Amino acid sequence: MHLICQSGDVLSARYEIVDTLGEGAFGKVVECIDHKAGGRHVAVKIVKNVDRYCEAARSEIQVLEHLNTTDPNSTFRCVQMLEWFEHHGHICIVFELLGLSTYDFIKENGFLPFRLDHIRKMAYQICKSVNFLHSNKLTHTDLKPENILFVQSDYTEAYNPKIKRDERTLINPDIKVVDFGSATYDDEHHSTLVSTRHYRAPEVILALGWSQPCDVWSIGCILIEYYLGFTVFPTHDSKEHLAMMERILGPLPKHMIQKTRKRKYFHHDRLDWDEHSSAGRYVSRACKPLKEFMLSQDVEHERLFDLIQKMLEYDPAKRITLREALKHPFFDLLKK
Ligand SMILES: O=C1N=Cc2ccc3c(-c4ccccc4)c(Br)[nH]c3c21
Ligand SMILES: [Br-]
Ligand code: NA
């Protein structure tokens, strides 16, 4: 891929590569000049020439033709796909050009959180967008801050005496949702494993089956990360992940424990986790009950945390739907 994704390379006798916007497992996304469309900049996803990513790219193209036809104006803020082509055996998907991902903005700003009023707007848009998917018999399955992009990531920058550091303040917090290569229709095969680990729902970890509610779980994780500026379940070990969950949210429901095929995590229907081991003391000291993460007792913080708590309901059958989430009091300040 390195040989065809360089600055200056031309794709499909039309798109001149400017630079790389980001890289993933799948390949990379590059900003290009569209020399046919008078020099307009676009984003081109160059997909690795590897079966699993080719297949996901083909699936993404189908999902986006469906979504972009149903919502041609992007009222529901899914990214607009413009075209696709093949270039030296790589599938390339052209999209409208967006700004930084919400993840990169956090990272570039030194892992500082977003302001609450921005979180409120971003959350509403994310819920609206994913609800539109949920209304069309789709589950995204891979929601994460890297897949939520600012329409424009421009910021103002000033020294802030309070934290004795320069600080970027986002100008326009409008977002779009990207990456529909894992999105699954209600009547299609469900992989056992979905979502990036940190955003993965307990029903997925426990291999209990999943559907739209697993997106809601991922959104809860995203919102807490927007609030705090860091990932709340940063581990790569499933058992430790579940231990973190229990410290933050309390014990898993017994019926879910009883149903799982992943017997290895449990012993006599409780998590098989030594709280006094090294890893265990770390989980106790670093994690804590969800509400203790609040940085203020002000009612707007309480409202956000009530919503996050409901999104992080363990039992997916009881978890708040995005339809209900859009009516939550946290969003009242957006409404006339
Ligand atoms: O500007 C864009 N218009 C569509 C699009 C899709 C994915 C991206 C990404 C991206 C996201 C996750 C991992 C790697 C890259 C960036 Br950063 N910019 C993108 C755009
Ligand atoms: Br980015
Ligand atoms: Na998770």
* Phi, psi dihedral angles at 29 (to 5 degrees): -120, 130
- Beta partners for residue 40, in sequence order: 34
143 lines ligand 1 (CB under 6 A): no
Distance between CA atoms of residues 181 and 105, nearest Å? 23
Q: Domain span at residue 179? A: 75-78+98-336
For 125, counting Cβ atoms within 10 Å of its Cβ (0-12 exposed, 13-18 middle, 19+ buried), the class is: buried
For residues 7 and 116, membership in a common domain is answered with no
Does residue 24 have a known ligand-binding role?
yes
98 lines ligand 1 (CB under 6 A): yes
d(CA 22, CA 97): 12
52 and 182 part of one domain: no
User: Which ligand is located closest to the Cα atom of residue 236?
Assistant: 3
- Are 26 and 50 within 8 A, CB to CB? no
Strands, sheet with 15-24, edge to edge from the N-terminal-most edge strand: 10-11, 15-24, 27-34, 40-47, 90-96, 81-87
Number of the ligand closest to the Cα of 24: 1
97 CA distance to ligand 1 middle (Å)? 8
Alpha carbons within 13 angstroms on the beta-carbon side of residue 272 total 10
Task: Tell whether 126 and 37 lie within a shared domain.
Answer: no
Distance CA 67, CA 63 (A): 6
Q: Are residues 184 and 325 in the same domain?
A: yes
Cα-based distances in Å from 160 to 76, 212, 322: 35, 41, 36
Q: Are 84 and 121 in contact (CB under 8 A)?
A: no
CB neighbours (10 Å) of residue 203? 22
Question: How would you write the chain as a 3-class SS string?
Answer: CCCCCCCCCEECCCEEEEEEEEEECCEEEEEEEECCCCCEEEEEEEECCCHHHHHHHHHHHHHHHHHHHHCCCCCCCECCEEEEEEECCEEEEEEECCCCEHHHHHHHCCCCCCCHHHHHHHHHHHHHHHHHHHHCCEECCCCCHHHEEECCCCEEEEEEHHHCEEEEEECCCCEEECCCCCCEECCCCCCCCCCCHHHCCHHHHCCCCCCCHHHHHHHHHHHHHHHHCCCCCCCCCHHHHHHHHHHHHCCCCHHHHHHCCCHHHEECCEECCCCCCHHHHHHHHHCCCHHHHCCCCCHHHHHHHHHHHHHCCCCCCCCCCHHHHCCCHHHHHHCC
For ligand 1, pick from 34, 48, 98, 103 the residue to mutate: most ligand atoms within 8 Å of CB: 98
Q: What's the rounded Cα separation, in Å, for the pair 273 and 252?
A: 13
Same domain, 118 and 89: no
- 167 CB under 6 A from ligand 1? no
- Do both 115 and 154 map to the same domain? yes
30 & 120 share domain: no
Q: Are residues 315 and 174 in the same domain?
A: yes
**Structural domains of the chain, count:** 2
104 CB-contact burial (10 Å; exposed 0-12 / middle 13-18 / buried 19+)? middle
Exposed / middle / buried, residue 59 (Cβ in 10 Å: 0-12, 13-18, 19+):
middle
- Are both 88 and 147 inside the same structural domain? no
Question: In whole angstroms, what is the distance from residue 314 CA to residue 332 CA?
Answer: 26
- C-alpha 243: how far from chain center: 22
> To test ligand 1's pocket by mutation, which of 5, 18, 23, 29 has the most ligand atoms within 8 angstroms of CB?
29
In angstroms, the CA 224 to CA 299 distance is: 16
330 labelled ligand-binding: no
Task: Please give the distance, rounded to the nearest whole angstrom, from the Cα atom of residue 18 to the centre of ligand 2.
Answer: 15
| CA–CA gap between residue 103 and residue 122 (Å, rounded) | 13
* CATH number of the domain that residue 3 is part of: 3.30.200.20
In angstroms, how far is CA 249 from the centroid of its own chain? 20
Domain closes at, from 65, 97, 129: 97
- Among residues 97, 131, 165, the one where a domain terminates is 97
Which of 26, 68, 101, 129 is the best mutation target for the ligand 1 pocket, counting ligand atoms within 8 Å of the beta carbon and taking the most?
A: 101
Q: Ligand 1 in contact with 248 (CB < 6 A)?
A: no
Q: Which of 62, 97, 132 is the last residue of a domain?
A: 97
Please check if 280 is assigned to a binding site: no
**8 A C-beta contact, residue 69 and residue 81:** no
250 is in an annotated binding site: no
* Deposited experimental method: X-ray
Whose alpha carbon is nearest atom 9 of ligand 1?
A: 22
- Cα 64 to ligand 3 centre (Å): 26
Q: Which residues are catalytic?
A: 142
Resolution for this PDB entry, in angstroms: 1.9
Q: Is the CB of 101 under 6 A from ligand 1?
A: yes
Ligand 3 mean position to 272 CA, how many Å?
18
Residues 167 and 257 in one domain: yes
Same domain (yes/no): 181, 312: yes
Contact at 8 Å (CB) between 311 and 304? no
The closest of 141, 176, 123 to 60, measured between CA atoms, is 141
In terms of domains, do 110 and 89 share one? no
Angle at 113 between CA 111 and CA 115, to 5 degrees: 150
